[PDB]
Structures are given as structure tokens and as C-alpha cells.
Amino acid sequence: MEEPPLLPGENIKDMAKDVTYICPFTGAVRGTLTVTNYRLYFKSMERDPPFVLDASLGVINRVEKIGGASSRGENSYGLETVCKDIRNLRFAHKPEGRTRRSIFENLMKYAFPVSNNLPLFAFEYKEVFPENGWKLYDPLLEYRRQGIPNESWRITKINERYELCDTYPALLVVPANIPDEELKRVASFRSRGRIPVLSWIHPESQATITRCSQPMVGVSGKRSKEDEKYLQAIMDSNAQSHKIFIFDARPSVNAVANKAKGGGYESEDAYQNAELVFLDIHNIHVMRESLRKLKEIVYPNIEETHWLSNLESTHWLEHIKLILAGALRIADKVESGKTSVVVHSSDGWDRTAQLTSLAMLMLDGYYRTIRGFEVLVEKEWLSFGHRFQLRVGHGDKNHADADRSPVFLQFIDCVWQMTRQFPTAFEFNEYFLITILDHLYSCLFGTFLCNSEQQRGKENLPKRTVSLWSYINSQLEDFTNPLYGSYSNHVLYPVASMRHLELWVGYYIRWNP
């Protein structure tokens, strides 16, 4: 009865009878706690419908022991799982029941398989679907859709074996007149060899969106004649504007600080035909801290009296605002400015991925379809080396790792904001976005594992794991926006202000009924 449902490949690893779950909203409820290789399940027939708590082990970052027998209090002895999904779960065990240690140990083992030399559930998950999500994204075909390779832009195979840049995809689009040996020189000037490459091209103006990492200028004004020519080549392809725009996602202070560490930005002297703009979007450590502050004000209980000022102090929505405002500036420079833009950050993987993809969503209605959005994720995030496994910490017990940051979560939040402002512009619904966020942590699928395309290939995820798109695409009805259709040629111009943006209740505050 209180036994959990099981996915093909899932197994019960431990079970504790008469454990009390301390629900923050309804109160204590005694039932059975079960741990599988995929989830934590709690069910009690001591209510009606039975009470059911079902969470993927992947959302657990920590597990803490609460009390000892040296605790006389009612439900003072037990466990608490701190979760990535904007909650914490607290259970109470009876010392004489001798279940706490066992549950604690099995949780530490199965929620953090990587740390315990076990596989992530995605490799054990053996269900089969009608569609194969791994066949969804085809680089060459996406470029074709964009009218890519052409006269101005060619496809180079120089990174066919990730020699040029190992955090980059295999195929890269660069200016038709720039030879590979030259790409190699630009690569030594750009951080981690993440040179400027095409993300999107306007079908009418030929203004483009390129992306890259910061130029290694350093404390002395080191210049790269080839990088300068490369950017000039980017500009010479767009026959319109007599200038290019470089959007550095960082606040100026951080760009200057990077220069001090060896990196930097494109100066007015070195890049004569480029205008650089700082977008004031802070780093991963700042975003991690903003979410931490938000979780503490939304979960368990909100203090309504100071909601607005408490929300303000998190600076969550301010970050969302700066990210959307930056994407907006990029889209507008390309669309109404007919100007090409180069987008970067320090590393070019985090903020840069947020910026290109959001601008792209505004500009191209294709990315607003369910399949096109899946392509966008596979393209700008996965193939371009947003370090997913490190930013999420899949199956790793090191909860304090400073590499963990809600970068993709912020992106999805921004997508949801547009979805609110344009209720008929997207083919997918909110449920689709929340589902993506749940599986970002679940590790049921192989879609968000590994930190680069090269890694996913070496680990052969297409053949060893199931794609999230396989699940989603073979089951559309749930993720389709019924209002969709009344748009999708035109550019989206969301408004980025503290008065037009909201806190995504459906996601951050979904645990209270």
C-alpha cells in the first residue's frame, strides 16, 4: 500500500515503517518512508486520499541528522533533507525503531551516487519511448534553417575533434573569409579558446549574434591582430551598420578585475569599429547567494507584512531584470539596429548562454515552438558547454561547492516571464518549463549530464541514457499551450522592469496547497 511506484530499472533500497513526516503546512503524519535508486517516497494511509511525498533523490543536496536519544522532545529525533527545489523535508524517527541510521546511510548513498562510485539513475533508467530525443538536434540542419553555410559564413570542421576548443561544439560557423590557421590564433587570445562563432543570423539584414569568452588582454594592453581582424570580418559580412556591438555581460568593475587577472575586454583603441556595452549582470557566486536569500523568505511560510521589501532584499528579481534587459538590448540592436553583435562574459558559458538564447527567443519564432525550444537548449546550452553537472552538482555530496549556481534556472525563469507577457507566443506551457527544471535535478535523463558536448560523446549518453525530449515529445498534450498560434514571425519585446516582472509562484512557492 504505502510502497512506491517503480520506473523500469528502479529498485527499493531501504524502507522504514512508522516514520513521521513533519509537514510545515498540515502537520505531522506517520507512514512509511522508502528510498529507491531514483527517489525518496513517503506515504501514509493515516489520512485520506493517502498523504504522499514523492521527490527525486537528485534534488537532495544535503541530509542532516536531527537530535539524539539525548532529545526528549516529540519528533525531536530524525532527519532533514535540504533540497534544490525550494524546500526542505523533515522526518522524525523513533530511536528504538532503529531506522534512522539505515535511512540516513541509504540516502547519502543513493542521492549522491557519484560520490559513492555508483551510477546516476539515468544509466539504470530503462523505459522506452516512441520518439528518440537524441535525434532532435542536428547542428548542420539548424544552420541550414538559418540559411547557413552561405557567402558570408562558412562551416569549419577544425573542432571536429575538439582540438580548437574542447568546450565548444564539433561544428563551428565563422566568417567565410577566415581560414582555420587563423581561427587557431584567435583561439589563443580568447579565454579557453572559446572564439567568436555564430549563434544566429537575421534572415533579412544578415546582422548576426556571435558568442565567445573574454579576450586575454591582461595588465599590459596585449592585443591580438587576428582577433581584431576576426571581429572586423564579422562586421564586413553585415553590409549595413558601419559598426559592431560587443555586449560584455559583466559589470565594468568585474571586467576591469578580470583584466587584472589576465582577461579583460575589447578597448576602444584596439577595436576601432566596435562599441562595447557592460550589462551589469553579476557572477555565479552572486546568483547562488540571491537564490539562497529567496528560499529562506518563501519557504515554509511567507511573512506577508514585508513580502515586497523582503523580496527586494533577495535581489532575485533584479537579477532576472538585468538578464532580460540585456537580452532585450541585444535583440533590439540586431532587429531595429540592423547591427551585428558579439556577446561574451568572462568564460562565455554562463551569462553568455543566458543572453544569446533569450535574445534568440525574442527574435526567432522557431525557438518558441516546443521542438525549437528543445533545439535552443541543446544548441546554446548543451553544445556550447554550459557546465551543467558542475553547476548542479549531480550525485555529489559536496553541497558547499562554489561552482553550484542557478544559471539555467534563471534562464528558465526569464523564459517564463516572457511567457506571462506573451500568452500566445509560445507553443509550450508552464508545465513544460517546470518539468524541465524538475529533470534538471532528477538525473532521470542524460540530457543535463556532463559539462560539454565532448564529454557527452565520450560517455555515449545518446546510447546509454534516455533524452528528456524522448519523454516530452512522445506525450505532447500536457506541454502544449492551447492559445499558441496567434504569432511567430514577429519579434518579442518584453518589458524588463520591477513592475512588469513577477516572482514565479508556480515554481518557487508550489509546495503549499
**Site residues (vs ligand PIB, CB under 6 A):** 191, 249-250, 254, 257-258, 261-263, 283-284, 345-352
Minimum CB separation of residue 196 from ligand PIB in Å reads: 14
Judged by CB, which is closer to ligand PIB: 216, or 362? 216
User: Which residue in 210, 202, 272 sits closest to 239, CA to CA?
Assistant: 202
Judged by CB, which is closer to ligand PIB: 254, or 290? 254
Tell me which residue has its CB nearest to ligand PIB.
261
Minimum CB separation of residue 81 from ligand PIB in Å reads: 27
Judged by CB, which is closer to ligand PIB: 56, or 213? 213
Alpha carbon distance 330, 276 (integer Å): 12
Judged by CB, which is closer to ligand PIB: 114, or 286? 286
Alpha carbon distance 349, 375 (integer Å): 17
Q: Give 365-425 as a 3 state SS string.
A: HHHHCHHHHHHHHHHHHHHCCCCHHHHHCCCCCCCCCCCCCCHHHHHHHHHHHHHHHCCCC
- Residue 269 per-residue DSSP state: T
Judged by CB, which is closer to ligand PIB: 220, or 309? 220
Q: Which amino acid is at 457?
A: G
Judged by CB, which is closer to ligand PIB: 261, or 292? 261
Q: Name the 3-class secondary structure at 22.
A: strand
Minimum CB separation of residue 2 from ligand PIB in Å reads: 44
| Crossing angle for the helix pair 316-335 and 284-298, to the nearest 10 degrees | 130
Alpha carbon distance 262, 278 (integer Å): 18
Which residues 6+ apart lie within 8 Å of 253 measured at CB?
A: none
Minimum CB separation of residue 213 from ligand PIB in Å reads: 7
Q: Name the 3-class secondary structure at 343.
A: strand
Minimum CB separation of residue 258 from ligand PIB in Å reads: 4
Judged by CB, which is closer to ligand PIB: 141, or 253? 253
Minimum CB separation of residue 16 from ligand PIB in Å reads: 40
Minimum CB separation of residue 403 from ligand PIB in Å reads: 7
User: Which residue in 134, 202, 209, 197 sits closest to 171, CA to CA?
Assistant: 197
